[PDB]
Structures are given as C-alpha cells and as structure tokens.
C-alpha cells in the first residue's frame, strides 16, 4: 500500500502554502486546496507573457488530451480561470496518480496572473464538485485513495515554517493528545462539519457549520461574530485595501475557539495577528467576514492551530492541537 | 397538484426551440436544455450593447441576490457565459417556481451574443451538475417536481411547427402506441440511456450509450457510425463552414434507428435532411460527429421523431413515435 509526505511551505505572512507536484515529469508549485475539486495548472497554452515567472505544464510531451472537454471556475472576488483537459502522471509526496486529469489553463484572471508564488491549485475537496465538462473528473486524492494504506490525508500548516500533507497515514507526532472526530456532510462537495458553540474572547455564542479549507488564507465567520471579536480589540478598524479589520501590531488579541464534537479547537490570539496589513503601519486580523454566505470558512489561520485528518471513511474530520 | 403545457417553437431549420418563461414578471424566450442544469439569462448586468435584440432579466426590481455566488459554463465549441445569481419567481407553462435560482449573465461569448433568438437557457438535466458556486442550485424542474401531479416532464419537438414541454403529466395524444421505458444513469447529471444496437441505413452495429439532449440541434454519433451512414449517401462531403457532412438537397437519405429496451426509435431519412447548409447549394446532414467523446448526443434531429418522457421516478425515459 502507498502513503507519502508532501511538504508544504508558506509564502510571506502565510498568505498561501505551496507544495511541489510533478506532472508529466515537470515539477510545479501548487496551492493544495481542500475547498476545490479541480487540479488546474499554468500551461504552455497560456500567452507566453502569462507564463513568465511560473513553471508550466506542457501537455504536448506527455499528456493524453480529453478532446472536447473544458473546465472553468469563477470566484466571488471576481477571479476566474478556464481551459482544457489532459490526463497525465501526477506525483505528490512520492505517491503517483496515473491517468490523473490535469486542467490546463488557457485563461486566467489578474489575481492569478499576479501571484507568481504558485503555478495552479490541487483540489482535495470531494470529486462531486469537480468542474470538468462534459464528464467530471476525480481529484488526485480520489484517484489514489484505494491504493493508499488508509483512504485519508492529514494536514499540518504552520506559521512561517514548513508543514506537511500526509497521504495515506496519520502522523501522531504532529499533534498533542488524541484526535477527536466529527461527521462530515459532503453534500456540497466540501469537508463540512458542525460546531456546537464558539467563544470569541469574552463572548460565547451559538454553533454553526463550516468547511475545512486550506485554500483560504483567513478564518471567515459571520459578520456578527466578527463584530463581537473586534469589539474587544482596541482601535480595530476596517481597511478594504488591507482585506478587512486591522489594528496596531502590538495589540493583545483575544483567543477564538469552537467546540467540535466535545473537543475545543482554540486559535490563540497570537495566530490571529496575520501580519503587516500592507497599508501603512497596522496588522491585519486573521478573522474576517464570510460575506453573508451562512457558513464559516475554516481557512489557514485556523488550521495553523490544529492537525486535521480528512478521512474518506465516514467521511469524517479528526482534530487535535498542533504539535 | 400542478401541471402545465409550455409551448416551444423552432427557429429557422429547427436550429433550436424557444419557450417563453416569465422571470420576476418579465417574459424571456429561453432554449430549454435537458443537457444542462443551469437556468441562465441575459440581464441588465451585461453591457447595454449586448442587451440589444434581447429581452433581459432585471434583478433589481424583484430578485433576491445570493451575495458571493457565481456561475460559469464553458463549451467544447469555445462558447462560454458567466455571472452572478438571484432567486426569483419563474413561471413556465403556468407552473410557478418560487425562489428559483436565476443565473444572471455578466459575460457571454460571441456565439451567444450573435443568437438573438433566445435570451438564455433553461436547464432540465439533473441538479447535481448545476454550476453555481459556492453551493449548487436546483433546476426549475427539481424546484417544482414535488408540487407536480407526477414528477416528470415530456417533450414533443417538431419540424417547423410548434411543440410542447408537458410538465407534470403525459399527453398520450402526442404519440402512437404505448411508451417503452428504459433506465436512466444520472451519475453524470444527464438523462443517459443505453441502446442495444443501431441501424444506419443498410448497416447495423453494436449498441452504446447516449443522452437525451434538447439543447443540441443535431444527432451526434461516433465517427465510425457517421462514416457508415454517409458512405450510403451519394456525393456526401464535409463542409466545416456548414457544420459537417452536406449533400445535394434532393438526395434520398437512409433512415437511422436505435433499439432501446426492445423499442425501435426510427429517425426517417426526411428528418435527417436538416435544411440548407448556408454554404451554397447543399443541405446539411442531421447526423454528425460527437467528436470522439465516447457517448452519443440524442439532439433535436432525433427528438423530432419521438415523444419522450423524462421521469424522475427511476429515473427512466419513455419513448414512442411522435404523433
Ligand atoms: C466554491 O468554493 C470555493 O471557492 C472554496 C471554498 C469557499 C466557499 C465559500 C466561501 C469561501 C470559500 O474556496 P477556495 O477554493 O478555498 C478559494 C481559493 C482561492 C481562489 C482565488 C483567490 C484569489 C485571490 C486570493 C485568494 C484566492 C483563493 C485567497 C483567499 O483566501 N480567497 C478566498 C476568499 C473566500 C477570501 C477564496 O476565494 N478561496
Ligand atoms: C456539458 O454538457 C453539454 O454541454 C450538454 C450535453 C453535451 C455533452 C457532451 C457533448 C455534447 C452535448 O450540451 P448542451 O447543453 O445541449 C449544448 C447547448 C449549446 C451551447 C452553446 C451553443 C453555441 C452554438 C451552437 C449550439 C450551442 C448549444 C448548438 C449545438 O447544438 N451545440 C452543441 C454541440 C455539442 C454541437 C452544444 O454545445 N450543446
Ligand atoms: C506511509 O505508509 C505506508 C504504508 O503503511 C508506508 O509504506 C510508507 O513508506 C509511509 O510511511
Ligand atoms: C518534505 O520536506 C519535509 C522537510 O524536509 C520532509 O520532512 C517531508 O518528509 C518531505 O520530504
Ligand atoms: C395538468 O395536470 C394537472 C393535475 O392532474 C391538472 O390540474 C392541470 O390542469 C393539467 O391538465
Ligand atoms: C402553448 O401554445 C400551444 C399552441 O397554441 C398550446 O397548445 C399550449 O397549451 C400552450 O398554450
């Protein structure tokens, strides 16, 4: 049976985490995203000017084209990308998926062009939400899942240090104590789970649902919860240039936690100071608005505090404090 | 319980069929498409120049916005469209879906801009393939299905005459004899069914699968089957300007049939003469290539010969010769 450890590395301020992936023999630095079921890459089909500053997939040499197939993704921030599809060999952490669908980019919007830190995204959400037309494809994980020793992956994202994606086994040295599991609702293709309550500093409130999403930088919560959190942060104010609420970098931030199946997942206030806001001399808050969507996005700020097991058996998520 | 009859009308040469749909009180002429799960419309969010020659949805007056939601579709011909989403009242054949998701167009490609015959598409495929992000929406049919007298719809497309979409009941006067049912595989979100064999004129061959797709003008089959068909048509030759194989308009075309669960669905040769090719003095063939996709597209050319029941119970498709 297979397993492997793929090492991830955060970019500045942990805006994203990149992990190398060898496709048809070329290694690309991809953003692993548990909130997406697409594996899309910068490719030789983009205009040459858009290829600059990236490693790019060249399908002509090794890929098998799925003639007539397309893909396209659109985000609420206004970003988008689209293209065609080839199958190829895709290796992550020493685990190879043969015949894996690779969505080659033909078009990408400004946000993607501007980020030279990654060459695309590798999706780890459920395959039911893969965007390939006319017949959807399986994610890297779903492709290799039955070959793994256990049909799961796990992740340790860290603050300014390398982390791991463990495929096919659990590394118990990556957390303190025992894992606590909770059921996953995959009906929207996400690793969605329920929280029974939250505590934002001095205030506690009702539970809600959310999704474990490595592809989102911050922890996105309902506006009401965000307001209660920042009401406790002296001088906090919104700055749309920065991304939301910002505050003096020396501020002592409250912790934020959620109760999941009896386990308290605590994000220490230190991890809620994302870093320099990039708009003068303030720091950006790790907690921000989910913009009214009615469910929470447990992005990197939250994940940095935990080791999280994504188990297809259930399916279910396991959590414990990161060690 | 509800039911209703929506009348469809073919454009020139039956290139598509349009059916009126009232959205937030504005009536738009939509292309009903059993091969899509999206209900997308030209809207006031398009550039004004792109709105010309169309009726357009104005969400400001009646729609409820799903903030942060997007949609985007990409086709193998290179067409595409994308936008945002609102829920609104959508009435088809006197049957109203309250709170139906309406995908307002913000961007549309040339093929859509150029066709002033429709104001968008109303999808009737399974909701599992709806493209709305971050949470997919239900089609008009899935929205109203449990309110209907029976959870099915049926369609009679005709050559140069008005036809119907029957919602919630079967009109037995629309076909000869009794319906024959066959099981549907909805795993790719399509009304996919199996054929046991086909007969292209003087040649018969092995079975295959395909999808009942009102949104495709022609009958698309494997290249091998297309070649065998046209090998029997004197003077047939491909013309990429026209869309594929063309031939003298007076040619006597062979029939084409498929065996489905013991019922023979025959498309008479008369219906295989699509019409003027629009490239000099030849006519376009109703049968063309599926471009290597490995499954057949039972588009309008085929559907014009049958009455077809799309029954969610099973699910299953019923067929009989159109009356
Ligand atoms: C449809 O599912 C998504 O798009 C999934 C899950 C989701 C669902 C709803 C709300 C938010 C997230 O997002 P994702 O694939 O992880 C998606 C990945 C992604 C795509 C383009 C981006 C462009 C600029 C910046 C970021 C991007 C991230 C950083 C960022 O965290 N952006 C968030 C937004 C929400 C601040 C984001 O769009 N993240
Ligand atoms: C993902 O599902 C589709 O796109 C579904 C089903 C499908 C699947 C695979 C092959 C063909 C069809 O197609 P549809 O929604 O019915 C889709 C609807 C559609 C969309 C844009 C179009 C632009 C120009 C011309 C047509 C269009 C039809 C006429 C035409 O028949 N076009 C075919 C091609 C195939 C000749 C077509 O793209 N049709
Ligand atoms: C992950 O687990 C597999 C199977 O148990 C090992 O073979 C592999 O080397 C790694 O430790
Ligand atoms: C990626 O790199 C890390 C850190 O060197 C290793 O621990 C991991 O196994 C993988 O090689
Ligand atoms: C369709 O069927 C319904 C329910 O049987 C009728 O009420 C309707 O008027 C139409 O004939
Ligand atoms: C659409 O129009 C047809 C033809 O007039 C009717 O038969 C149908 O019931 C609907 O009104």
How would you summarize this macromolecular structure in one to three sentences?
The PDB classes it as hydrolase. Keywords: penicillopepsin, phosphonate inhibitor, hydrolase. Two copies of one chain form a homodimer. The first copy, chain A, is mainly β and 323 residues long.
Describe this entry's structure for a reader.
The structure is a homodimer of 323-residue chains. Chain A has 323 residues and is mainly β. Chain A has two domains: 165 residues, Cathepsin D, subunit A, domain 1; 152 residues, Cathepsin D, subunit A, domain 1 (Beta Barrel), CATH 2.40.70. In chain A, 11% of the residues lie in helices and 45% in strands. In chain A, the strands form three sheets. The first copy, chain A, has a seven-stranded mixed beta sheet. The interface between A and B is medium-sized, with 23 and 23 residues. The site of one ligand PP6 has 13 residues of chain B, from loops.
* CATH class bucket of the largest domain in chain A: Mainly Beta
Helix fraction bin of chain A: 10-25%
Query: Structural class of the helices, strands and pairings of chain A?
Result: mainly beta
Question: Main interface pair?
Answer: A-B, 23 and 23 residues
Bound compounds, each kind once, are: the ligand COC(=O)[C@H](Cc1ccccc1)OP(=O)([O-])[C@@H]1Cc2ccc3cccc(c3c2)CC(=O)N[C@@H](C(C)C)C(=O)N1, alpha-D-mannopyranose
Distance between the termini of chain A: 27 Å
CATH topology of the largest domain in chain A: Cathepsin D, subunit A, domain 1
Beta strand % of chain A: 35-45%
Which architecture of the largest domain in chain A per CATH?
Beta Barrel
Strand order of the largest sheet of chain A: 18-17-12-13-22-14-21
How does the major sheet of chain A shape up?
A: 7 strands, mixed
Kindly report the oligomeric state of this protein.
homodimer
CATH superfamily of the largest domain in chain A: Acid Proteases
Shape of chain A: globular
Q: Quick one: how many beta strands of chain A?
A: 24
Summed up, the helix count of chain A is 7
Q: What is the radius of gyration of chain A?
A: 19 Å
Provide the number of structural domains of chain A: 2
Subcellular location (chains A, B): Secreted
Family (chains A, B): Belongs to the peptidase A1 family.
GO molecular function, one term (chains A, B): aspartic-type endopeptidase activity
Glycosylation sites (chains A, B): 3, 7
């Amino acid at each position: 049976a297979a397993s492997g450890v793929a090492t991830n590395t955060p970019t500045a301020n942990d805006e994203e985490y990149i992990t190398p992936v060898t496709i048809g023999g070329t290694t690309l630095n991809l953003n692993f995203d548990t909130g997406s079921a697409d594996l899309w890459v910068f490719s030789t089909e983009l205009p040459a000017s858009q290829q600059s500053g990236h490693s790019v997939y060249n399908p002509s040499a090794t890929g098998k084209e799925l003639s007539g197939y397309t893909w396209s993704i659109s985000y609420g921030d206004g970003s988008s990308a689209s293209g065609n599809v080839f199958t190829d060999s895709v290796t992550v952490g020493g685990v190879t998926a043969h015949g894996q669908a690779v969505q080659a980019a033909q078009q990408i919007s400004a946000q993607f062009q501007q980020d030279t830190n990654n060459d695309g995204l590798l999706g780890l959400a459920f395959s039911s939400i893969n965007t390939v037309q006319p017949q959807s494809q399986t994610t890297f994980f779903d492709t290799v899942k039955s070959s793994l020793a256990q049909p799961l992956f796990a992740v340790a994202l860290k603050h300014q240090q390398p982390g791991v994606y463990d495929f096919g086994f659990i590394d118990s040295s990556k957390y303190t104590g025992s894992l606590t599991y909770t059921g996953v609702d995959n009906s929207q293709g996400f690793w969605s789970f329920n929280v029974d309550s939250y505590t934002a500093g001095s205030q506690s409130g009702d539970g809600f649902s959310g999704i474990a999403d490595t592809g989102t930088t911050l922890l996105l919560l309902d506006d009401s919860v965000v307001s209660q959190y920042y009401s406790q942060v002296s001088g906090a104010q919104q700055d749309s240039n920065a991304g939301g609420y910002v505050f003096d970098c020396s501020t002592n931030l409250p912790d934020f936690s959620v109760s999941i199946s009896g386990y308290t997942a605590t994000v220490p206030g230190s991890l809620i100071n994302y870093g320099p806001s990039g708009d003068g001399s303030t720091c950006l808050g790790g907690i921000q608005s989910n913009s009214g969507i009615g469910f929470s996005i447990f992005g990197d700020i939250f994940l940095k505090s935990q080791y999280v097991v994504f188990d297809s058996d259930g399916p279910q998520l396991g959590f414990a404090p990161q060690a």
